[PDB]
Symmetry: none
Subunit: 124 residues, 4 copies
């Protein structure tokens, strides 16, 4: 039922905090997360700093689900990589751009895949 | 304080239902709304049906703010048009694509501007 | 998988009682949140004697959008007034539980899409 | 408008007590929700005697994101342990109201951005 609770929190939240590392510096940013099961996906650009951070250090921490001080939320430590499956990239692209998507594609578009290694439900 | 309540609901919600008209048919769709004061903006593509609907009939109805059966929400009847100010279009583009934006632009991108004529707070 | 589809639609309907009912009056759209009961794919929803509006039965109903991570239904159909007293009573017994004691719009679907 | 900027930052801090504190241990990021007090732009947050971690004072703090329609702060600074007992007590009197009775991390900012 633990997965079930994890999934419930993921189903109800698409914004989270990604913390990546640049040498000795943490970088925290708010962004949109899609998920497929316990796998997370977040959009990026080929030239964006968060993309280069991930290429050089795959260790990321995601916080997601904190609505108010009483919200149970997730702390996810995982390994991030750039999604190479073109069908997954196109699908995510179409989901992200659905309000305006009319078949264009974006060459600089990339997807950060996050494979969780540890998931803690906090404030449960 | 009525505006203040309207704004509070707009500040806390970016997804709403747009209802447009195609001849004698209503079309309802969920989508993302940005606002500037009581003016609403929603992204679209030049060739999308909702864009053509608006070109031919500017009368739209937006429902926004319904979280649960007890939520106070808004019913907005307004006049929709395609935003022609390039700086407003680019700004909205940058806000929408911020997670992946790296300077590209999208020729098919358009912005639907909605000027409210009537706003009712329901379930207050 | 016409049967898995039917099954997914009924499931969404069985698990949701509130939807969005949209219509058109003249060249003007209208939208409101409504409480919906269903019999199969047919929907029922409860709602001046000195005024009349030109009837347009074309409606669009959105049901099931609970979270951004929700599959929901877009239903295009024809709305009419339900006159059967037994049906209206069955609706009252379901929508008015503590009350002891009224129009019902019937929506027959022509097209149903599961959107995500 | 260095002064309107300072003013907007203080306002965000004055109106928010919860933020996100991020750090790095080795080559691994850490993130947690924390309760923050502030003195001007300086932040204070309360938090095994058989273990020690290699100290990295580089932290990133996000404060003020309340709704998607929120301007918030990204603060990059240096974290340290606050040793002043008077300060620690002032923090306790603000964070522990019903209690009658403890480390405090001090964050000095090096860069602050208002993001939207």
């Amino acid at each position: 039922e633990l997965e079930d609770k994890i999934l419930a929190i993921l189903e109800q939240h698409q914004v989270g905090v990604l913390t990546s590392v640049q040498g000795d510096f943490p970088h925290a940013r708010y962004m949109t997360f899609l998920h497929d099961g316990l796998t997370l996906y977040t959009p990026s650009g080929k030239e964006l700093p968060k993309t280069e951070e991930v290429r050089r250090n795959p260790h990321v921490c995601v916080l997601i689900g904190y609505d108010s001080p009483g919200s149970a939320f997730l702390e996810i430590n995982g390994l991030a990589s750039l999604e190479e499956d073109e069908s997954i990239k196109e699908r995510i692209w179409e989901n992200i751009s659905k309000d305006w998507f009319q078949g264009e594609d974006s060459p600089s578009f990339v997807v950060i895949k996050i494979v969780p290694e540890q998931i803690r439900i906090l404030n449960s």
